[PDB]
Write a protein that binds this ligand. Structure first.
Ligand SMILES: CC(C)(O)[C@H](F)CNC(=O)c1cnc(-c2ccc3cc(C#N)cnn23)cc1N[C@]12CC[C@](O)(CC1)CC2
Length: 284
């Protein structure tokens, strides 16, 4: 199944969890909401380790459990692969050579901008992954561009299943990234339709290249830009990412239409993941 790695083995490959950037000689490639991630070559396998960092110490460990439990039942080309763990805190995965969709849309660390054809394939790959999760009666609850990772071929892979749940119920701990969350999820509802809403936000990020939340931007919330388009003030061509030259207006408007259906405030009128798949497949 999974390999139980040892703590010290992870420290040696991470250069003692060197939080410095790679170009400076460290190992940190990024940080999550609940942990940090470093590169570390292990048995010639380049690997990303997730030293969790808390929201008490118990809950952080139960989410450590949930990721392992979901990753054992859900293997798919559009999901990340859990290689193993270190508990005596750490979750070991196959290193994704191209990081997160969020960082690549912002061209972080100097990576070239994504073309429209890569973005369309990434969206289809991400929807294909969410479809596999929803087919197995699992809800991600944190669909966002930072949790859509990209391999050497820019194949989209959904990651971070610590918040995942079995597949409408209510909870006492509202968790997630608010800039992506559906209104019902912000109140404590758990439904796969929230995943659809959050995927619509990612589709907006893909079209525009704008992060879902930007503190130095007006509007700060990418959702607040859809309404500015909807009330006819502007159009979606005014917000197409300018860091691409292979975008056609017919396909861009098709992905926006998918995003708009996904972003319906009322959840029951949002399409399910299978319909979102079909619409994204029709676009190409
Ligand atoms: C060369 C480049 C262009 O620099 C490139 F980017 C280098 N490769 C990476 O940076 C990078 C590589 N493999 C992963 C990876 C692989 C599996 C998992 C699982 C889980 C969870 N659960 C998180 N990560 N993960 C994450 C990575 N980077 C992140 C940066 C910001 C984040 O928020 C934390 C880590 C999301 C992705």
């Amino acid at each position: 199944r999974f390999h139980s790695f040892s703590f010290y083995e992870l420290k040696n490959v991470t250069n003692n969890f060197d939080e410095r950037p790679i170009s400076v000689g460290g190992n940190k490639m990024g940080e999550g909401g609940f942990g940090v991630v470093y590169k570390g070559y292990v048995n010639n396998t380049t690997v990303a380790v997730k030293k969790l960092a808390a929201i008490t110490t118990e809950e952080l460990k139960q989410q450590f459990d949930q990721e392992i439990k979901v990753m054992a039942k859900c293997q798919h080309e559009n999901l990340v692969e859990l290689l193993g763990f270190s508990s005596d805190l750490c979750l070991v995965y196959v290193y994704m050579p191209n990081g997160s969709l969020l960082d690549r849309l912002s061209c972080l660390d100097g990576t070239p901008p994504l073309s429209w054809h890569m973005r369309c394939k990434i969206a289809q790959g991400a929807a294909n992954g969410i479809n596999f999760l929803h087919e197995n009666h699992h809800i991600h609850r944190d669909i966002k561009s930072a949790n859509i990772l990209l391999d050497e071929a820019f194949t989209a892979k959904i990651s971070d299943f610590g918040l995942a749940r079995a597949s409408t119920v209510m909870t006492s701990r509202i968790v997630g990234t608010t800039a992506y969350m559906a209104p019902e999820a912000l109140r404590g509802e758990i439904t796969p339709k929230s995943d659809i809403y959050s995927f619509g936000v990612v589709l907006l990020e893909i079209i525009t290249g704008l992060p879902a939340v930007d503190e130095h931007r007006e509007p700060q919330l990418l959702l607040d830009i859809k309404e500015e388009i909807e009330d006819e003030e502007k159009t979606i061509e005014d917000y197409i990412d300018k860091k691409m030259n292979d975008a056609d207006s017919t396909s861009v408007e098709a992905m926006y239409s998918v995003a708009s259906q996904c972003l319906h405030e009322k959840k029951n009128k949002r399409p399910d993941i299978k319909k979102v798949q079909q619409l994204l497949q029709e676009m190409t």
